[PDB]
Design an enzyme around this catalytic site. Structure first.
Site, short mmCIF file in Angstrom:
data_model
loop_
_atom_site.label_atom_id
_atom_site.label_comp_id
_atom_site.label_asym_id
_atom_site.label_seq_id
_atom_site.Cartn_x
_atom_site.Cartn_y
_atom_site.Cartn_z
N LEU A 1 -50.37 -186.60 32.22
CA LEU A 1 -50.37 -185.45 33.10
C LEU A 1 -49.26 -185.58 34.15
CD1 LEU A 1 -54.22 -185.10 33.65
CD2 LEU A 1 -52.81 -184.20 31.80
N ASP A 2 -48.99 -184.47 34.83
CA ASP A 2 -47.97 -184.39 35.87
C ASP A 2 -48.62 -184.08 37.21
OD1 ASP A 2 -47.90 -181.34 36.34
OD2 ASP A 2 -47.58 -181.48 34.18
#
Ligand SMILES: CCCCCCCCCCCCCCCCCC(=O)OC[C@H](COP(=O)([O-])OCC(O)COP(=O)([O-])OC[C@@H](COC(=O)CCCCCCCCCCCCCCCCC)OC(=O)CCCCCCCCCCCCCCCCC)OC(=O)CCCCCCCCCCCCCCCCC
Ligand SMILES: CCCCCCCCCCCCCCCCCC(=O)OC[C@H](COP(=O)([O-])OCC[N+](C)(C)C)OC(=O)CCCCCCCCCCCCCCCCC
Ligand SMILES: CCCCCCCCCCCCCCCCCC(=O)OC[C@H](COP(=O)([O-])OCC[N+](C)(C)C)OC(=O)CCCCCCCCCCCCCCCCC
Ligand SMILES: CCCCCCCCCCCCCCCCCC(=O)OC[C@H](COP(=O)(O)OCCN)OC(=O)CCCCCCCCCCCCCCCCC
Ligand SMILES: CCCCCCCCCCCCCCCCCC(=O)OC[C@H](COP(=O)(O)OCCN)OC(=O)CCCCCCCCCCCCCCCCC
Ligand SMILES: CCCCCCCCCCCCCCCCCC(=O)OC[C@H](COP(=O)(O)OCCN)OC(=O)CCCCCCCCCCCCCCCCC
Ligand SMILES: CCCCCCCCCCCCCCCCCC(=O)OC[C@H](COP(=O)(O)OCCN)OC(=O)CCCCCCCCCCCCCCCCC
Ligand SMILES: CCCCCCCCCCCCCCCCCC(=O)OC[C@H](COP(=O)(O)OCCN)OC(=O)CCCCCCCCCCCCCCCCC
Ligand SMILES: CCCCCCCCCCCCCCCCCC(=O)OC[C@H](COP(=O)(O)OCCN)OC(=O)CCCCCCCCCCCCCCCCC
Ligand SMILES: CCCCCCCCCCCC(=O)OC[C@H](COP(=O)(O)OCC[N+](C)(C)C)OC(=O)CCCCCCCCCCC
Ligand SMILES: CCCCCCCCCCCC(=O)OC[C@H](COP(=O)(O)OCC[N+](C)(C)C)OC(=O)CCCCCCCCCCC
Ligand SMILES: Nc1nc2c(ncn2[C@H]2C[C@H](O)[C@@H](COP(=O)(O)OP(=O)(O)OP(=O)(O)O)O2)c(=O)[nH]1
Ligand SMILES: [Mg+2]
Lengths: 70, 98, 99, 49, 347, 88, 120, 140, 55, 320
Positions: F42-43
């Protein structure tokens, strides 16, 4: 010895909302000392109205967004 | 006891059962109190008009006068309930415990 | 401490200050007069005069009279052949038994 | 002058004292008169004085 | 509130009650109650806080419903007798509605739920009116219609009131809720002797008012509304705790105090009518009342609860409360048993 | 009163439940100690969305200064337990 | 039960017929007790307001005693009137209905049989 | 309730136990419906079926107590050939108390219910014989 | 067994225990206008269907 | 006659006796900031009554003969022992603060009664509205417990709401080093133990929590140490205040009558200062309280209601 008189432990039995705690009355708390509850969080719902542009008194191209109470 | 008295007495019972079963609005219950006064007015007016009880003919009017006082009094309390909670819901009227 | 409370006081021995104490009061003047009233009214009056009063009650419960009366009746009945004591307290003539 | 602030009851309220004593005397006179009148009427109605 | 407006509204409360007592026409009786409710509510809203608003609203809803049932009884009684006189009702259904309307107004069980809540939500002075003066008008009507009241209905309400009042008062630490459940229990004694001797209903009402007015006056003097607040009285006004002890013992029906008289006379009338099981049950159930009066004496007069430091500041000021008629009421509420035969003046 | 209290087992289950409803997380790849950035991929903004889901689940506000450190499911459990006084 | 009595004196504290009865004596023990209750009210009044109980405001103590005795005297007149009326009605009714209150045939214990229960 | 009671008291004691059991079960069941109404009204059920479940729980407890009392008090008065005997009601009352214990899953309530329901049943029977009035008509 | 347990556990301890339990039932109320008046309706219906107080 | 509904109905109405000079002024500041000197002068120039700052013995000064009572009749609270040992276990820190609030609460009621009964203004020093600065300072320095602060807010929440704020708030700002230097000059052995951190907590409470709170309800005037010396300048600013904000503009005869009934009944003013909350700092055992109360009633002129004490020369008891 000296005559016994109630201590804080004894007196706090009589400071609760009820004398016989139960599951239902576990979240009961004694009322305010002067019967005055805190006022509820401000929830005043002003009425917003577009007064114009297509309005006889708006001079044609005025969008007057008005907060109205009544 | 003609067939009209049945419906009038049933109207009172309906408004009484309506007043004793709150939904949410205090205003909805106030209407049932004014509905009950209407039934009593009609039932009293019918009996008095049918028996030619002349002096009693003012009683129904005196019954409406004090129905307005109660209705106005109930509205005045509804203003203060609304000012404290923002609605006329009866479930908010529970700070006092039996 | 959970609160501001005086420490429990110690007992006071009335003998320490007044070795002649009678146990009635701290004040020697009151202590002596407390003892005199108890002894004079308790022993010299109630128990002694009450004892003499009870001893000379004027024939309590009429028991001495009943003895003289019994002697008078016993002498009268034995001198006339009547029974000493009959089995009927009431003359049957006044009794009207059923059917 | 012992008190820093004059007590509300520092000195007698001579108005109340007169009314209080006056009221008691009136009631006693009224009651005594009432009792005498009641006794006279009682004897008059029962024909014994 | 303007003092003149308070006086006018106070006199309107009395006028409504007085209209009910002097009225011989049913319509005027109904007008009396409506006038009484119209004037009482502003005295409940006097302090203008949410709890007082709820108490007034619950009170209005209950009283308004009762007045509707009372008017239904009057009109039904009109249909079957063609007259408005305030006497025995002429229809069984009219009697039940009027009896229930008068039970709701009095706060008898099972129409009692408002009494504990309304009393808690209003000041002590307003509560005193609620539990003493508001009982005069409904009791006036019951006194005149008792020949037609169903015996089972009135005795059932009386028994439930004595039970619910005693049980409800055990689980309470608020004085206004204790006085509220005590009131419900005492209503039972008034209406239980009603079918047999209405005079004894008046006696118990008069003695209940005097004792109840005495308790509120003493709670009003110290501004105490909770058990613990009242537990500090011994450290400020020691005499006031003795008077509370004597009055509470009187309210419990213990001889030789005054409050034993109404029980004693009520048992007499019911036993003359061969009612033995009910007086015995009523007297025994009344021990529930005496228990939570004893619990107040323990924490008030017979023991010394913990104090707080600031109490020392209250020792330097006198009681400025009016405490009107308190010396007279406390004596009448404790030493009147030797004058019991004076109950004949009520006849 | 009577409602069951919060337990670290309960907090852990609910946290892992929210993370399974998240669409960008493979359900059969979520470990209670897996890093949001390194493991799940994820970011930054994905992490912000997760924290907002936690606020909805547990009904309390998580500031940005604190939410910037919760980089794995276990750290969320510690923070929620720490702020809810659940020492169990 | 006497609310509707035939006496047409309604809402009167003392009907005029009550003046045929002797008034209470001013030394009546019931009236002395009422006066005593007034004295106790005077002392309790001093104590709640923190005054010398026995000495403070003798003017106010006298008004307590007088007020109680004054009211007590009239409550005793009405109390005795109501009991006098109760006996008047009771005897009149017994006279008006002789069949309901017959004179029982007298018997003596020498003629009446009573079961004997030994205590042994 | 006047109708059912008159039906119950018209059947002579120790006879027609099938009918008397019907009468008592009706009285108990009605009592359990009166309790259910107030319980549902004052303690709002969380759902309709949760409230129908509560109504059936209380109504069956009261019906079982009423059924066991009339059955146990009627066979007892039949076997012993002693109709006008409060002991029959004492046995019936205690049996009803035991049923209350079983439904409550409490031995203590079973013992207490048996003792007080037994006495009450016996006292009810004595009052029927002697003429005791709970709500006595005014006479003086 | 007798003085400190069973003589206590029959008369004084059970009787007290019941009144405490009945006190909670009476007082544990939600304080809702909706529920109280609903009970009033039940009382009036019971007073007529069951007990025939209207006749 | 004694003020009540009857007096109000007969004409004793507050507005008829209040003028444009009927102002309630409070002088605030840190320790040793010239408040006492400044406050005393503003009273003389404006013709206002002056109330010396409420202390441990304020209540003793209004009752009896007005002289301080022994320290056992005040809870043994000592401002001296607070400075020497601000962390003692006998709970002398909060016990002092709770007592002082009751004294300020009493003084403020006394101030309001004077203003409403005669129309004359008053000048106060650190009224109840500013007493919380010391509490906030004691807590931040570990001198009192968290529960004590909860107790203070509960008592304050049910008492502060009944009164009106002062018309004008005079604040004498002084930086802490000036105060610390000024404290040492005064040469009071106990006061000199006040750490600088404590004085900075008072400063933060005054500016940051107090002045913003009072700015929206009162006329807030701020003066430095240099411009506070000339009370003439301060009086001139007060004379030309507009008085365009605050609850005082919404008051009328009915509202002030209710206020005067409260402030004249002192036991009603102090009703909630002894709420049944059992903190060890303020809770007193029954045996101790009983003994002290008995000793209080045997002081000269305090066994009976004022005016009925023979030992102090009162007379006509039998007719009074
Ligand atoms: C007709 C016959 C009526 C008989 C009663 C006549 C006296 C009653 C009026 C006196 C009065 O002011 O009290 C009313 C009443 C007294 O209330 P209070 O404040 O509790 O009285 C104590 C004060 O400390 C009172 O102290 P104070 O300093 O404030 O005032 C002194 C007061 C002192 O007055 C008193 O003595 C107070 C006590 C008198 C009232 C006692 C109650 C009434 C007695 C009957 C009740 C008992 C019934 C009998 C016993 C039971 C059955 C046998 O004297 C007067 O004021 C004289 C007024 C003359 C007019 O005052 C009012 O507010 C109403 C007016
Ligand atoms: C103001 C009235 C409201 C306050 C009184 C509330 C008390 C109600 C219950 C007790 C009423 C007193 C008992 C009746 C009584 O003795 O007084 C009426 C007595 C006797 O009236 P009575 O004998 O005709 O009966 C009326 C009252 N009942 C029916 C209830 C008994 O008359 C008077 O005292 C009035 C004359 C003085 C008028 C001034
Ligand atoms: C007309 C007059 C009216 C009178 C009204 C009378 C009102 C009184 C009625 C109150 C009844 C209340 C019963 C409550 C029962 C509670 C049971 C329970 O919950 O469990 C408690 C316990 C079980 O609770 P437990 O298991 O948790 O343990 C209890 C011990 N502690 C407290 C430490 C936890 O069980 C019992 O002990 C009950 C005892 C049953 C025996 C009862 C017999 C009573 C018989 C009468 C007394 C005998 C003398 C009289 C003899 C007469 C001879 C003719
Ligand atoms: C013969 C003469 C008959 C005389 C009686 C005639 C009555 C006919 C019915 C007309 C009167 C209607 C009464 C008003 C009913 C009502 O208002 O219900 C309120 C109550 C609250 O519901 P709510 O807050 O919306 O929440 C959902 C809970 N179910 O809603 C509910 O809880 C359930 C609603 C059920 C409504 C049925 C009412 C009929 C039974 C009443 C008793 C009959 C006597
Ligand atoms: C508790 C006790 C509380 C006592 C409160 C005071 C109540 C008693 C007051 C008595 C005062 C007497 C005043 C002097 C009498 C008098 O002069 O008459 C005044 C007035 C007129 O009398 P009247 O009978 O109407 O005229 C007939 C003419 N043919 O007649 C009257 O005004 C009569 C007084 C008014 C009526 C008072 C109430 C009467 C009933 C007594 C209630 C108290 C019952 C106490 C029961 C206790 C039981 C132990
Ligand atoms: C085995 C199980 C036994 C079942 C219960 C026993 C039934 C027989 C009881 C009985 O005697 O009947 C009473 C009544 C029937 O009506 P009735 O006309 O009196 O018939 C003659 C009766 N002798 O039948 C009954 O209604 C008895 C049960 C009484 C129920 C009372 C419950 C409260 C009623 C109000 C419901 C809630 C409020 C309504 C509004 C909310 C919306 C519906
Ligand atoms: C009508 C009786 C009173 C009532 O409303 O009961 C409602 C109860 C559950 O209804 P519920 O959806 O939980 O209402 C919640 C409102 N906040 O639902 C019920 O009525 C349960 C009782 C049903 C009647 C029992 C069977 C006969
Ligand atoms: C008029 C009759 C009204 C009937 C009530 C409404 C129907 C109830 C339907 C069943 C509801 C579910 C329920 O729980 O009731 C079942 C009941 C026994 O209750 P139970 O399941 O054993 O609960 C645990 C006991 N501790 O079993 C039952 O007995 C339910 C039926 C009650 C009426 C029986 C009368 C005999
Ligand atoms: C749960 C509720 C359901 C169970 C209770 C219902 C069963 C009991 C009802 C009583 C029986 C009844 O109603 O009939 C009256 C009975 C005799 O009836 P009967 O023979 O027809 O009279 C004419 C004789 N020539 O005569 C009798 O009942 C005698 C009465 C004896 C009462 C003894 C009770 C002692 C304990 C006190 C409880 C009663 C007081 C509590 C308050 C009651 C409120 C209703
Ligand atoms: C078809 C026709 C049938 C006829 C039946 C005849 C009547 C018999 C009824 C029996 C009912 C039944 O089964 O009683 C059984 C119940 C048992 O307790 P429980 O609550 O079930 O325990 C369940 C426990 N668990 C939940 C753990 C499983 O008894 C009782 O509580 C009584 C126990 C205490 C003894 C009381 C006697 C002493 C006190 C009395 C003093 C005077
Ligand atoms: C009232 C009974 C008097 C006794 C009492 O109790 O009245 C209470 C108060 C007096 O209380 P206070 O002001 O403290 O004086 C008493 C105590 N003193 C002396 C220590 C200060 O009287 C009033 O307010 C009465 C005012 C009367 C004006 C009425 C207005 C017109 C009414 C119109 C109706 C349609
Ligand atoms: N703990 C505590 N101490 C207080 C309180 N009010 C005053 N004091 C203390 C602080 C000081 O040591 C002492 C005097 O404070 P002041 O503000 O009056 O300073 P001072 O009189 O020395 O000079 P000044 O009047 O300002 O010119 O009393 C209070 O509410 N709580
Ligand atoms: Mg200074």
């Amino acid at each position: 010895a000296r005559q016994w008189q109630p201590d804080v432990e004894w007196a706090e039995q009589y400071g609760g909302a009820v004398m016989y705690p139960t599951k239902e009355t576990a979240h009961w708390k004694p009322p305010p000392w002067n019967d005055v509850d805190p006022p509820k969080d401000t929830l005043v719902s002003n009425l917003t109205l577009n007064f114009g542009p297509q309005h006889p008194a708006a001079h044609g191209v005025l969008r007057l967004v008005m907060e109205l109470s009544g | 006891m003609s067939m009209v008295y049945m419906n009038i007495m049933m109207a009172f019972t309906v408004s009484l059962v309506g007043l004793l079963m709150y939904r949410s609005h205090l205003m909805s219950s106030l209407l049932c109190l004014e509905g009950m006064m209407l039934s009593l007015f009609v039932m009293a007016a019918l009996t008095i008009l049918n028996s030619h009880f002349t002096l009693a003919s003012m009683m129904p009017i005196i019954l409406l006068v004090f129905a307005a006082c109660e209705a106005a009094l109930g509205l005045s309390l509804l203003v203060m309930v609304s000012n404290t909670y923002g609605t006329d819901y009866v479930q908010n009227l529970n700070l006092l415990q039996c | 401490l959970r609160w501001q409370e005086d420490p429990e006081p110690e007992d006071e021995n009335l003998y320490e200050k007044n070795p002649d104490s009678h146990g009635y009061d701290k004040d020697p003047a009151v202590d002596i007069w407390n003892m005199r009233v108890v002894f004079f009214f308790g022993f010299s009056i109630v128990l002694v005069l009450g004892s003499t009063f009870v001893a000379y009650l004027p024939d309590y419960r009429m028991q001495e009279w009943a003895r003289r009366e019994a002697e008078r009746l016993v002498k009268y009945r034995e001198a006339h052949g009547l029974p000493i004591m009959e089995s009927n307290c009431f003359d049957p003539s006044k009794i009207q038994l059923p059917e | 002058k012992f008190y820093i602030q004059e007590p509300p009851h520092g000195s007698p309220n001579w108005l109340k004292v007169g009314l209080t004593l006056g009221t008691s005397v009136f009631l006693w006179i009224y009651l005594i008169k009432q009792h005498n009148e009641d006794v006279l009427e009682y004897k008059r109605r029962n024909g014994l004085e | 509130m303007n003092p003149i407006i308070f006086i006018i509204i106070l006199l309107t409360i009395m006028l409504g009650t007085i209209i009910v007592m002097i009225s011989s026409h049913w319509l005027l009786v109904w007008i009396g109650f409506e006038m009484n409710m119209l004037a009482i509510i502003p005295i409940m809203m006097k302090n203008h806080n949410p709890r007082a608003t709820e108490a007034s609203t619950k009170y209005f809803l209950t009283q308004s419903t009762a007045s509707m049932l009372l008017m239904m009884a009057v009109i039904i009684n009109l249909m079957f007798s063609g007259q408005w006189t305030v006497m025995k009702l002429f229809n069984p259904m009219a009697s039940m509605l009027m009896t229930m309307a008068l039970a709701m107004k009095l706060g008898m069980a099972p129409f009692h739920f408002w009494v504990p809540e309304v009393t808690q939500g209003i000041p002590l002075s307003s509560g005193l009116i609620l539990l003493t003066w508001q009982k005069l008008a409904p009791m006036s009507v019951l006194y005149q219609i008792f020949p037609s009241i169903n015996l089972n209905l009135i005795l059932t309400l009386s028994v439930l009131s004595i039970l619910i009042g005693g049980w409800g008062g055990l689980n309470q630490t608020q004085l206004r809720k204790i006085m509220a459940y005590s009131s419900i229990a005492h209503m039972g004694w008034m209406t239980a002797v009603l079918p047999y001797n209405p005079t004894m209903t008046l006696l118990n009402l008069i003695i209940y008012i005097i004792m109840t007015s005495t308790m509120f006056t003493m709670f009003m003097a110290n501004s105490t509304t909770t058990t613990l607040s009242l537990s500090h009285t011994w450290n400020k006004t020691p005499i006031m705790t003795v008077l509370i002890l004597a009055t509470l013992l009187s309210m419990g029906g213990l001889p030789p105090l005054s409050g034993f008289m109404p029980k004693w006379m009520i048992i007499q009338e019911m036993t003359k009518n061969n009612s033995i099981i009910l007086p015995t049950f009523m007297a025994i159930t009344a021990l529930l009342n005496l228990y939570f009066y004893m619990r107040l004496t323990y924490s008030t007069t017979l023991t010394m609860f913990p104090s707080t430091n600031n109490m020392k500041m209250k020792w330097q000021f006198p009681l400025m409360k009016k405490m009107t008629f308190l010396p007279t009421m406390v004596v009448l509420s404790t030493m009147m048993l030797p004058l019991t035969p004076m109950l004949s003046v009520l006849e | 009163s009577d409602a069951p209290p919060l337990t670290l087992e309960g907090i852990k289950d609910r946290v892992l439940y929210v993370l399974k409803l998240y669409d960008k997380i493979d359900p059969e790849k979520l470990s209670v100690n897996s890093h949001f950035m390194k493991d799940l991929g994820l970011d930054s903004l994905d992490q912000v969305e997760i924290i907002m889901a936690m606020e909805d689940e547990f009904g309390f506000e998580i500031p940005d200064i604190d939410a910037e450190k919760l980089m794995c499911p276990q750290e969320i459990v510690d923070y929620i337990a720490d702020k809810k006084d659940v020492y169990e | 039960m006497m609310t509707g009595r035939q006496g047409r004196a309604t809402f009167q504290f003392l009907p005029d017929e009550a003046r045929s009865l002797p008034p209470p004596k001013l030394t009546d023990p019931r009236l002395a007790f009422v006066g005593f209750l007034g004295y106790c009210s005077g002392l309790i009044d001093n104590a709640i307001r923190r005054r010398p109980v026995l000495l403070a405001g003798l003017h106010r103590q006298l008004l307590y005693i007088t007020s109680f005795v004054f009211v007590g005297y009239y409550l005793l007149k009405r109390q005795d009137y109501m009991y006098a009326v109760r006996d008047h009605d009771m005897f009149s009714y017994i006279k008006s209905h002789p069949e309901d209150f017959p004179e029982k045939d007298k018997k003596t214990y020498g003629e009446v049989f009573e079961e004997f229960h030994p205590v042994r | 309730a006047k109708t059912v009671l008159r039906q119950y008291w018209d059947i002579p004691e120790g006879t027609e136990c099938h009918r008397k059991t019907y009468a008592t079960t009706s009285i108990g069941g009605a009592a359990g419906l009166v309790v259910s109404a107030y319980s549902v009204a004052l303690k709002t059920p969380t759902s309709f079926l949760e409230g129908v479940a509560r109504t059936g729980r209380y109504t069956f407890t009261a019906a079982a107590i009423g059924a066991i009392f009339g059955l146990t008090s009627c066979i007892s008065a039949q076997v012993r050939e002693k109709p006008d005997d409060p002991l029959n009601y004492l046995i019936g009352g205690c049996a009803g108390g035991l049923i209350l214990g079983a439904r409550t899953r409490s031995y203590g309530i079973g013992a207490a219910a048996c003792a007080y329901m037994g006495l009450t049943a016996a006292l009810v029977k004595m009052g029927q014989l002697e003429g005791w009035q709970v709500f006595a008509e005014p006479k003086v | 067994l007798l003085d400190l347990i069973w003589l206590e556990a029959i008369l004084p301890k059970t009787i007290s225990l019941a009144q405490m339990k009945a006190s909670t039932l009476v007082t544990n109320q939600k304080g809702l206008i909706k529920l109280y008046f609903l009970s009033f309706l039940i009382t009036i219906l019971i007073s007529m269907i069951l007990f025939n107080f209207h006749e | 006659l004694q003020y009540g509904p009857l007096a109000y109905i007969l004409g004793e109405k507050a507005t008829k006796k209040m003028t444009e000079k009927s102002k309630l002024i409070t002088v605030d500041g840190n320790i040793c900031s010239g408040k006492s000197k400044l406050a005393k002068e503003i009273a003389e120039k404006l013709g206002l009554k002056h109330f010396p700052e409420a202390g441990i013995h304020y209540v003793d000064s209004t009752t009896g003969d007005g002289k301080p009572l022994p320290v056992q009749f005040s809870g043994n609270c000592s401002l001296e022992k607070f400075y020497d040992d601000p962390k003692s276990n006998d709970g002398n820190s909060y016990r002092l603060q709770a007592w002082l609030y009751a004294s300020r609460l009493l003084q403020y009621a006394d101030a309001l009664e004077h203003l409403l009964s005669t129309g004359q203004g008053v000048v106060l020093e650190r009224s109840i509205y500013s007493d919380f600065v010391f509490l906030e300072a004691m807590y931040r320095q570990g001198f009192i417990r968290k529960q004590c602060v909860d107790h203070y807010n509960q008592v304050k929440k049910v008492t502060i709401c009944e009164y009106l704020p002062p018309h004008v708030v005079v604040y004498v700002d002084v930086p802490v080093p000036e105060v610390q230097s000024r404290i040492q000059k005064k040469g009071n052995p106990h006061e000199m133990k006040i750490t600088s951190a404590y004085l900075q907590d008072i400063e933060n409470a005054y500016k940051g929590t107090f002045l913003p709170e009072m700015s929206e309800k009162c006329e807030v005037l701020q003066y430095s140490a240099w411009e506070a010396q000339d009370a003439e300048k301060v009086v001139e600013d007060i004379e030309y205040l507009k008085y365009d904000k605050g609850p005082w503009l919404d008051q009328n005869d009915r509202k002030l009558h209710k206020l005067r009934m409260l402030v004249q009944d002192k036991l009603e003013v102090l009703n909630y200062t002894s709420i049944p909350v059992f903190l060890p700092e303020v809770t007193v055992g029954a045996h101790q309280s009983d003994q002290v109360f008995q000793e209080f009633t045997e002081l000269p002129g305090r066994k009976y209601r004022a005016g009925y004490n023979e030992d102090v020369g009162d007379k006509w008891i039998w007719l009074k």
